[PDB]
Ligand binder design. Structure first.
Ligand SMILES: [Mg+2]
Ligand SMILES: [Mg+2]
Ligand SMILES: [Mg+2]
Ligand SMILES: [Mg+2]
Ligand SMILES: [Mg+2]
Ligand SMILES: [Mg+2]
Ligand SMILES: [Mg+2]
Ligand SMILES: [Mg+2]
Ligand SMILES: [Mg+2]
Ligand SMILES: [Mg+2]
Ligand SMILES: [Mg+2]
Ligand SMILES: [Mg+2]
Ligand SMILES: [Mg+2]
Ligand SMILES: [Mg+2]
Ligand SMILES: [Mg+2]
Ligand SMILES: [Mg+2]
Ligand SMILES: [Mg+2]
Ligand SMILES: [Mg+2]
Ligand SMILES: [Mg+2]
Ligand SMILES: [Mg+2]
Ligand SMILES: [Mg+2]
Ligand SMILES: [Mg+2]
Ligand SMILES: [Mg+2]
Ligand SMILES: [Mg+2]
Lengths: 211, 52, 95, 147, 204
RNA sequence: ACGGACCAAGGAGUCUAGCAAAUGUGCAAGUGUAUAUGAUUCUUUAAACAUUUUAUACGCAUAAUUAAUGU
RNA sequence: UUUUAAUUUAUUCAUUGGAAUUUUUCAUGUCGAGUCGUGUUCUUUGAGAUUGGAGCACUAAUACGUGUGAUACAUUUCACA
RNA sequence: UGAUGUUAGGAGGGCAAAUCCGCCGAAUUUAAGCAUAUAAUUAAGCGGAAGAAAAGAAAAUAACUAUGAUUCCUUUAGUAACGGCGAGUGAACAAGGACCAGCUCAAACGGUUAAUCCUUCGUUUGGUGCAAACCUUUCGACGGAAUUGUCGUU
């Protein structure tokens, strides 16, 4: 090497030519994918090809203020809507047997989601012109007139999407309510200087409770 | 020997593409420029040429 | 660090019990089989050695029993559990 | 484009620009970063001084999402508000804005620059520095800690 | 039931009863051929835990495998190469002895059948002894049963030479998950190939 | 001192990755619509067009310094 | 010519079995062994007082157990499976 | 319980390899010499499958307001780490997308009655073809396997 250049680094020392891959057909493949998932819709004959998913928080102090879709409601969230895990699968509702509800906010949020979904679907009978009640929490069957006059509406696919955050980032306050004797930096530093002995005292509380 | 991993295409910024399309519509409305491209329009009335 | 199950969190980023402030939410057949199997099989040789070392009854013999069990099983924990079990057996045999 | 390459200017010349006496040979000084510390020492020392040796402690499994922390100074703090909204607060005198910077992607407020005189402001964040918090207090504001 | 008592007894192996039984069992296995058929499982409780069933097409075989390490295959023990590659007398094999036992009976002697599992029945200074469960995929008893007829499909031919039995899962690294077995699925070579790849946009 | 008996055709600084300097272009405290999805896109089109009906995907930049708790 | 969506039409009578929740009760079971693990030798990995595999020697506990939480120990707390 | 049987009915063997699964296993070359290292968990050698194969329903992450079987694409990132700490090498979690699916044994419970399964021989309903053939059908008899454990519940 000879000049003021960065020191070289390239990792090309094996037989690298045997596996190089140029992507000549990315748009062709998305056309194919679109046509396949469009063909499925005509085979369903009215029912949508999407399934309902819950709303959950992301796991880290980097993302904990965001929500997204998860893979399925819990047992308790389904029982809050009077549904059974087995019966729910026969509708586009996903079930997760291993997520837990640690707080009330998530429980109520997902129960309201399930209740809203359960109110906006019409049931078609298994045998034509034979309408019966539900089972396992499934809504009762519909009559042929409602089925005729809802087949001509546009299905709503916005219920399958994650909620969108509308929390604002500023507000207004009155000058008479400002607190003046609060010290943020000092509180932050005293909180860190105190942790170790507090952990010790919690451990001793745990020992006392066990016996 | 020629290879298939020659870089065949390019990527173009969106703003420059839009700017160029806009500047190419504007040139379509000048009588002198249209004539100099090779179109025989000595009998047209208006060069923008809107029709019902 | 540690948190508390009771006593909700403080809305501060650092310290003990920190973070956002959501609302928190809260055999007899076996020893029949044991007796049958025990009288079928008995004790193992290293178990017999541990038994006699315990039966001596001094503190040096106790430390020796721990070392021998730790060697035979290959783990401090395992060896400690084995010595405790043999101690219970020796106590029960004397009654 | 091969139309504009330098080698086409040497096309009738003998040595293609590399020299009669010193040829163009293949690897006459080593391969890659070969001779550093022996016969490439001067280049290494004047262009990359601290290159050889090691210093510091090891950190075996890092997990960078635990310490991620973007910052913002107090200069850019009135600029998060629209100008017509900034106008209204400077006019009226018994109201102040409450700004939550975590909703904008910042975690720690930092203290470079100058806040406007006698214009109270209330700021929410996860961490504060000492100087920033002093400057916010001086003009009549308040800092709030959130998680 | 009865099986729990057998299971608890076989956990000792050093009591006088089990020592006597093991000695007599292993004496007899030496006098028999290297690969011979048994009429019944000698450990019925252990055979139930693996997929054995008392149905017309299940059979049992017994194999004998030699112990230790195999020497590197070079004439007169001479290596032409670098000193890092001159080793011999402590080369160790990727496969278990249980897998080799399965392969001794599964390749040619009973190419008619399919290997399911196997289990330990004793050992010695020269040999280890195993019993192997096999299934016949052409008998109608297994071919009509909905629970077990997955074995009759041709994608399950010679499981014991492609690493697909339990012993094969052990030595490929598929018995541990997470951060201790990060680069082993869907296979070692496939994971290597994925990480060597250079992918390259048309427009870049 | 070495190559050259003669004539015709062929015959040698290129391609990819990664960095920098120079220069042209667009926007500017920001900038780049990734993988995907959409469309009354579908010989050409493997191109072109679009972006999810007080708005947190990711990179580089907007802040440094220390082995480090950190500041 | 294929295969598939709607749409069009049931009815009156017969028998035996099953299945989900909702009420009152009792019963607190089972859960994969020469296997896991430890020592030692050789390989392999980014894995470092050892990441996976293998040979030899020793050889467990019973859910109040066992395993993981990237530095070797002893005494413990907590989370996850 | 071994053996015997030209007894009745059946299976395995060879070819082919771009993609796929398992084992075995170099040196050239780079380090401006060379022995660890690199080339490379590669080439050559030996076995086994499919229209895909392999993997796969937690003895998994995290440390948060928590996520949630496998696979692949964009990033993480030439980063944490390994190394005659030289030449060189090099992952994982979170985040955005494609697709989307869950189940069976073993063990527990059922003894006024193994409920279970297979070979052979019959016979009985509706459809489709010119024909050849092919769907659908619940009844029985003799024989055998199985309590050293088939089937049902969960
Ligand atoms: Mg010249
Ligand atoms: Mg020359
Ligand atoms: Mg010279
Ligand atoms: Mg050699
Ligand atoms: Mg070897
Ligand atoms: Mg010469
Ligand atoms: Mg001559
Ligand atoms: Mg020529
Ligand atoms: Mg420039
Ligand atoms: Mg278990
Ligand atoms: Mg190596
Ligand atoms: Mg961790
Ligand atoms: Mg060399
Ligand atoms: Mg050289
Ligand atoms: Mg040499
Ligand atoms: Mg090969
Ligand atoms: Mg073959
Ligand atoms: Mg498969
Ligand atoms: Mg990736
Ligand atoms: Mg970067
Ligand atoms: Mg190493
Ligand atoms: Mg390597
Ligand atoms: Mg994702
Ligand atoms: Mg059972």
């Amino acid at each position: 090497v000879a000049h003021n250049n960065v020191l070289p680094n390239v990792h090309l020392h094996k037989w690298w030519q045997r596996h190089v891959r140029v992507n000549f057909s990315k748009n062709i493949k998305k056309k194919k994918r679109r046509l396949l998932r469009e063909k499925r819709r005509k085979a369903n004959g009215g029912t949508p090809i999407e399934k309902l998913h819950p709303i959950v928080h992301c796991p880290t102090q980097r993302y904990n203020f965001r929500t997204r879709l998860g893979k399925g409601f819990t047992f308790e969230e389904l029982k809050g809507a009077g549904l059974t895990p087995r019966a729910a699968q026969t509708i586009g509702i996903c079930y997760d047997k291993r997520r837990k509800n640690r707080s009330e906010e998530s429980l109520t949020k997902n129960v309201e989601r399930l209740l809203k979904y359960k109110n906006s679907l019409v049931m078609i009978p298994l045998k034509k012109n034979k309408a019966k009640k539900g089972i396992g929490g499934i809504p009762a069957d519909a009559d042929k007139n409602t089925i005729k006059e809802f087949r001509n509406k546009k299905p709503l696919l916005s219920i399958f999407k994650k909620e969108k955050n509308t929390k604002p980032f500023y507000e207004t306050i009155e000058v008479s309510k400002i607190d003046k004797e609060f010290l943020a930096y000092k509180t932050l530093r005293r909180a860190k200087l105190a942790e170790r002995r507090k952990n010790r005292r919690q451990q001793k509380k745990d020992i006392k409770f066990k016996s | 020997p020629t290879k298939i991993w020659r870089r065949w295409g390019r990527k173009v910024n969106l703003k420059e593409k839009r700017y160029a399309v806009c500047s190419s519509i504007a040139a379509s409305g000048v009588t002198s420029l249209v004539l100099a491209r090779g179109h025989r329009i000595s009998h047209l009335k208006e060069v923008p040429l809107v029709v019902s | 660090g540690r948190k508390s199950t009771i006593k909700p969190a403080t809305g501060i980023a650092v310290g003990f019990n920190s973070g956002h402030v959501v609302t928190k939410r809260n055999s007899k057949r076996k020893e029949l089989i044991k007796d049958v199997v025990r009288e079928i099989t008995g004790f193992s040789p290293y178990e017999k050695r541990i038994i006699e070392l315990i039966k001596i009854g001094t503190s040096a013999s106790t430390k020796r029993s721990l070392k021998y069990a730790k060697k035979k099983l290959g783990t401090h924990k395992r060896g400690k559990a084995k010595r405790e079990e043999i101690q219970k057996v020796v106590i029960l045999q004397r009654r | 484009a091969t139309r504009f390459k330098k080698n086409r200017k040497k096309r009738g010349h003998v040595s293609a620009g590399h020299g009669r006496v010193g040829k163009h040979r293949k690897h006459p000084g080593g391969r890659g970063k070969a001779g550093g510390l022996h016969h490439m020492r001067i280049n290494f020392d004047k262009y990359h001084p601290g290159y050889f040796g090691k210093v510091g402690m090891r950190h075996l499994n890092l997990l960078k999402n635990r310490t991620y922390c973007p910052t913002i100074n107090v200069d850019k703090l009135w600029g998060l508000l629209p100008e017509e909204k900034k106008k209204e607060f400077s006019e009226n005198k018994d109201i102040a804005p409450v700004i939550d910077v975590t909703r904008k992607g910042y975690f720690k407020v930092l203290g470079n620059g100058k806040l406007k005189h006698n214009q109270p402001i209330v700021v929410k964040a996860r961490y504060f520095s000492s100087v920033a918090e002093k400057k916010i207090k001086a003009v009549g504001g308040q800092c709030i800690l959130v998680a | 039931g009865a099986y729990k008592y057998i299971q608890e007894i076989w956990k000792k192996k050093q009591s006088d009863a089990m020592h006597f039984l093991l000695r007599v069992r292993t004496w007899e296995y030496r006098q028999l051929p290297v690969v011979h058929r048994v009429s019944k499982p000698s450990r019925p409780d252990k055979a139930r835990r693996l997929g054995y069933k008392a149905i017309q097409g299940f059979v049992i075989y017994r194999v004998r495998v030699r112990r230790g390490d195999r020497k590197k295959r070079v004439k007169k023990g001479i290596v032409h190469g670098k000193p890092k590659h001159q080793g011999v007398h402590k080369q160790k094999s990727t496969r278990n002895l249980k897998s080799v036992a399965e392969g001794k009976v599964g390749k040619s002697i009973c190419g008619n059948l399919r290997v399911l599992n196997s289990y330990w029945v004793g050992q010695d200074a020269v040999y280890k002894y195993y019993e192997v469960i096999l299934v016949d995929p052409n008998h109608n008893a297994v071919r009509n049963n909905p629970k077990i007829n997955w074995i009759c499909n041709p994608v399950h031919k010679h499981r014991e030479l492609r690493g697909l039995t339990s012993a094969g899962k052990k030595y490929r690294g598929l018995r541990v998950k997470g951060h201790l077995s990060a680069k082993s699925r869907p296979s070692i070579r496939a994971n290597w190939k994925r990480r060597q790849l250079i992918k390259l946009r048309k427009c870049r």
